[PDB]
Amino acid sequence: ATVYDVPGDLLVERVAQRLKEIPEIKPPEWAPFVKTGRHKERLPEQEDWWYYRVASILRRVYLDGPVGIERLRTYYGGRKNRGHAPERFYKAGGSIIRKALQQLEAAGFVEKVPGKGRVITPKGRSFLDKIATELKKELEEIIPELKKY
Amino acid sequence: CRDMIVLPEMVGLTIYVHNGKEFVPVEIKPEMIGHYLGEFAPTRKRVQHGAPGIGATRSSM
Amino acid sequence: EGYPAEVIEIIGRTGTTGDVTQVKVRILEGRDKGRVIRRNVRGPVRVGDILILRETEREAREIKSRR
Amino acid sequence: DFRHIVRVAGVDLDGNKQLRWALTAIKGVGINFATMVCRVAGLDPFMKAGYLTDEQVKKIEEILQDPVAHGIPRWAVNRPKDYETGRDLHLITAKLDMAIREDIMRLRRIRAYRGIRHELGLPVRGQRTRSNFRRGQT
Amino acid sequence: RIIQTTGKRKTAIARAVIREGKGRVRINGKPVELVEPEIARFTILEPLILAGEEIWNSVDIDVKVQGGGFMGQAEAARIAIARALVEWTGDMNLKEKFIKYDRTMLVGDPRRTEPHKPNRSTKGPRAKRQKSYR
Amino acid sequence: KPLSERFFIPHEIKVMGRWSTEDVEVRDPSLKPYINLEPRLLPHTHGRHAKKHFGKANVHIVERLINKIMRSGGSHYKVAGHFMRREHRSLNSKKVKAYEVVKEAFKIIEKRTGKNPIQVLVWAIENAAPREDTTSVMFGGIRYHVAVDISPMRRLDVALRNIALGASAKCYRTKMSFAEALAEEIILAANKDPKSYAYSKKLEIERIAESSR
Amino acid sequence: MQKARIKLASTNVRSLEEVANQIKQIAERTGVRMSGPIPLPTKRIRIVTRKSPDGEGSATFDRWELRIHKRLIDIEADERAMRQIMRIRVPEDVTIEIELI
RNA sequence: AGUCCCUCCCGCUCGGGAGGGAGGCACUCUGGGGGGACUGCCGGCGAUAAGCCGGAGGAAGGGGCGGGCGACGGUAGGUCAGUAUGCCCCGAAACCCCCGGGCUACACGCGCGCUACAAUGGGCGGGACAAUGGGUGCCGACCCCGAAAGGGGGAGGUAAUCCCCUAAACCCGCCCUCAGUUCGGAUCGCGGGCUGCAACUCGCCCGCGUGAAGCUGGAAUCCCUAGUACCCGCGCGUCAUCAUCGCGC
Ligand SMILES: [Mg+2]
Ligand SMILES: [Mg+2]
Ligand SMILES: [Mg+2]
Ligand SMILES: [Mg+2]
């Protein structure tokens, strides 16, 4: 019943709530006064703009094996609107992801493989697919083909 | 050296510059530090036009 | 109003911009029902379509022998 | 309880608008400043402005007269390193005007280059002029 | 037993896999029922909806595909599922009804893109600049 | 929206998984052999037809409808007065939004009456395709206006284009959204109301056609 | 052993297969295995330039091109084969290199 | 891909999934050699000819689709300011260097384009898949210091090996609703960086402020026949640095 089997934002939204307890994780002290990057144009609007980010960083690497920073600044960018001029792609800010992976390791879900990138521990796999299974355990109420697989 | 950046040395004083044909008097006051030297020596005289002539509009070709 | 007539032969294309088409068709019903006339049509047509007309007496004007 | 007009730091605003927005009307504060003062006062950023008592917006103005003294940092304030005293200041309606004109009068006092394009009134930031900015008459 | 199948549409390769089983089918990790471009989720169900729900009660299928775009993978996958179902039971009527509904589910696609040209070079072979009198 | 539908599963070979073409009736015989009615669930064909002559005859009708709103509108011949050049915020190639909006439009039709939507399209595109118009003929070196009859296929295509244009003209900077902006067109076309638009163009074409017979 | 791997890379496609099959033959001539020639990504370099010297007239464009061919062959290390691959006397428009892993 | 071990999770496990290693090149791939459509078979004219019509069969149909190649002569069109080149000129100069200013001036006429005049939307945040090329003066995987610009160590690479590289329109939830606005973002004020023998005239980026013309556009004219036209990004040339351009994707 692994994460390959469920829609994305559902599992994301889901884990984003019960991730409120782990006293490792909290918003840093430049949290409210910062837009997330060179492709934002407004601020974070909703309140739990921290926990969603921590979570959707959790989901990524699990089904992605070994990775690092310079690339996660390369999924999390968006077309900026540079003035009178045409549009161009960009990378995003990093200090976020930095403190993020710090507090996430300190939780214990991940670990650092030297010179190769980062990985997911057992704790992370079980913690994820648990909530995965819980989620599939009610969505199947209303669409009868989640039964067969 | 038009690209001097004036300092506590020269506040008040009087040196020249070069602007394309000449030397030029620039005398120093406070508030100048932080600027360059050449910033105060213009290079292209202003223009006060005459009148349009031949061709300037597609009737005159 | 709704009168249909059936296309039985295409004859040629006239019009200063190559648009009308010479087509001898037959009326199928009505006070005539069987008289075969001469008309020019607009659009593309195939031998075997079902055209509606509205006057059943217009008798379109002749062509330069189609060529 | 509902009032429809709340007057804070000079110019008022309606009480039908989201509280992060309508403060936009104070000359010298936009959106990406606004959510900051909102979240450092500690009050919802969505609420319809028509729900404000008095002492709150009192605090609001208080922050508005020293953002740095309470957590608003020193790299988004309306003039860092004030050229007359490098302190951190964010100004508003009454007094920005004064600042723009004094900082014009500076270059108007020394006959530098940059002033010449305020005086003679054409662009200062190094565009051209042989094709556009045709602002008068034939 | 097992059989393996392919197909290509505008540079989007599709490797299909078949075998006996229960009636589930996945793609690149995805269960079919979870595909947000529904106008795609209908581009691959049709050989799974004409075959009848019963042959669709006996099969395990997973596909691996790559290249192209989210509307380009769908039709390669469709070619996959069809050229597979035609060998699993491999009778004749079930090729028949796969002809009436559509053709290129079988005969392969020859439609391939085009170079560009040296006049705008950034749009296409036949969109030039805009001419200039006066 | 609701996840009961957001994920859908068909086991019935229909169109759009909601409605089907078995009992509709076009009355007007001139248009009968020219409106496909085979099941053809997915209305998307990738232009494998507009290459040989008279190929585009056999397409299911909803597809010919869905493609023919991928338009900023008209950009070189005025409509309702103004031009509606909307460029770069259009729907030109983005068929996705087209499918989506037409889905919502059909569901809105189904509500406010409760009938087979596509049969309602049948009533609509029966009453906006005229049956005569004009040209200029060369007769002796002198050329001038005359009138002739319109072949079916052109009736069909002009009909659909006028409907699309009309509906795409009540939304221009308008609180009304695009979806119901469609429905308020097919409805009126089926009610031959003067205030409609598709009926307007048939009426004002045949009028000035008979003005110079 | 050690899997010495030789290389080839030329421009005249014809004059490379000749020596490819030459080594194929010798490595067959003596008793020792040899992996077939491994074709590799052909290599191309595209250079365009404006066909007119001045700036008048319309602008018309050239497309010069030059494709680089690569091959690959693995052979065992039998010194009786080392000695044959030393009397190769290649054509001039081919480059060979030998390096054992 | 199908077989085998090892290792890790889940409804505790009967089944599901996923990482390595050893074996196979079956399948995609890379590429040399090969076969593959000829109006060929019939249907109809046209002489019965050369032909075009037609319909089958088929991966393809009647130049199979797209490019290279441009006859004689002109065009006193162009370029001696890419190299060559007759004559006349300067010849201590009209030669060769250096430090500075200039091609970047500004009531206005016109050409080619970018951003828009909001609902076929704007903004938050989640969720999806691409292709041609390039690399040692350069490319740079990975780690910690900054809010962002960047700086700090730098593993691995001269190439199907490591690197440039987890595009965008796209989908889904929330706020905004006929407004010169949450449309549009000129224009100007501060302050922090980059490369550079040298950034004021005259290079480039980013943080905060202010918030201009603009409500689809007269008489005219332009571009397009199928993976074409429209819409959305990327890679090269340029190059110590800046792409609203050409050129391919
Ligand atoms: Mg001449
Ligand atoms: Mg110039
Ligand atoms: Mg805006
Ligand atoms: Mg400058």
UniProtKB/Swiss-Prot annotation, chain A:
Entry's Gene Ontology cellular component terms: cytosolic small ribosomal subunit
Keywords for this protein: Ribonucleoprotein, Ribosomal protein
PROSITE patterns: RIBOSOMAL_S19E
Pfam family membership, one: Ribosomal_S19e
Key word Ribosomal protein present: yes
GO molecular function: RNA binding; structural constituent of ribosome
UniProt xrefs under SUPFAM superfamilies: Winged helix' DNA-binding domain
Gene Ontology terms describing biological process: ribosomal small subunit assembly; translation
Signal peptide: none
InterPro entries xrefs: Ribosomal_eS19 (IPR001266), Ribosomal_eS19_archaeal (IPR027548), Ribosomal_eS19_CS (IPR018277), WH-like_DNA-bd_sf (IPR036388), WH_DNA-bd_sf (IPR036390)
Family annotation (NCBIfam families): PRK09333.1 (NF006811)
Subunit structure: Part of the 30S ribosomal subunit.
Similarity comment: Belongs to the eukaryotic ribosomal protein eS19 family.
Function summary: May be involved in maturation of the 30S ribosomal subunit.
Protein name: Small ribosomal subunit protein eS19
Gene that this polypeptide is encoded by: rps19e
From Swiss-Prot, chain B:
GO CC list: cytosolic small ribosomal subunit
GO BP of this protein: ribosomal small subunit assembly; translation
Cysteines paired by S-S bonds: none
Sample GO molecular function, one term: structural constituent of ribosome
Record's keyword terms, sorted: Ribonucleoprotein, Ribosomal protein, RNA-binding, rRNA-binding
Family the entry assigns: Belongs to the universal ribosomal protein uS19 family.
Function: Protein S19 forms a complex with S13 that binds strongly to the 16S ribosomal RNA.
Protein name per UniProt: Small ribosomal subunit protein uS19
Name of the gene encoding the protein in the UniProt record: rps19
Part of the intact protein present: 67 to 127 of 132
UniProtKB/Swiss-Prot annotation, chain D:
Presence of the UniProt keyword RNA-binding in the record: yes
GO function term, MF aspect, one: structural constituent of ribosome
Keyword set, alphabetical order: Ribonucleoprotein, Ribosomal protein, RNA-binding, rRNA-binding
Disulfide bond annotation, renumbered to this chain: none
Keyword check for Methyltransferase: no
SUPFAM superfamilies: S13-like H2TH domain
InterPro entries: Rbsml_uS13_C, Ribosomal_uS13, Ribosomal_uS13-like_H2TH, Ribosomal_uS13_archaeal, Ribosomal_uS13_CS
GO terms, biological process: translation
GO cellular component: cytosol; small ribosomal subunit
Family membership noted in the UniProt record: Belongs to the universal ribosomal protein uS13 family.
Primary role: Located at the top of the head of the 30S subunit, it contacts several helices of the 16S rRNA. In the 70S ribosome it contacts the 23S rRNA (bridge B1a) and protein L5 of the 50S subunit (bridge B1b), connecting the 2 subunits; these bridges are implicated in subunit movement.
Binding partners and assembly: Part of the 30S ribosomal subunit. Forms a loose heterodimer with protein S19. Forms two bridges to the 50S subunit in the 70S ribosome.
Protein's name according to its UniProt entry: Small ribosomal subunit protein uS13
Source species taxonomy: Archaea, Methanobacteriati, Methanobacteriota, Thermococci, Thermococcales
Curated annotation (Swiss-Prot), chain E:
GO biological process: maturation of SSU-rRNA from tricistronic rRNA transcript (SSU-rRNA, 5.8S rRNA, LSU-rRNA); translation
Keywords associated with the record: Ribonucleoprotein, Ribosomal protein
A GO cellular-component term linked to this record: cytosolic small ribosomal subunit
Biased amino acid composition, Basic residues: 118-134
Chain segments carrying region Disordered: 107-134
Intrachain disulfide bonds: none
Ranges of compositional bias, category Basic and acidic residues: 107-117
Domain of life, source organism: Archaea
Cross-referenced Pfam families: Ribosomal_S9
SUPFAM superfamilies hit by this protein: Ribosomal protein S5 domain 2-like (SSF54211)
Gene Ontology molecular function terms on file: RNA binding; structural constituent of ribosome
PANTHER family from the UniProt entry: RIBOSOMAL PROTEIN S16, RIBOSOMAL PROTEIN S9
Record-stated family: Belongs to the universal ribosomal protein uS9 family.
Protein name: Small ribosomal subunit protein uS9
Organism: Pyrococcus abyssi (strain GE5 / Orsay)
Lineage: Archaea, Methanobacteriati, Methanobacteriota, Thermococci, Thermococcales
Gene: rps9
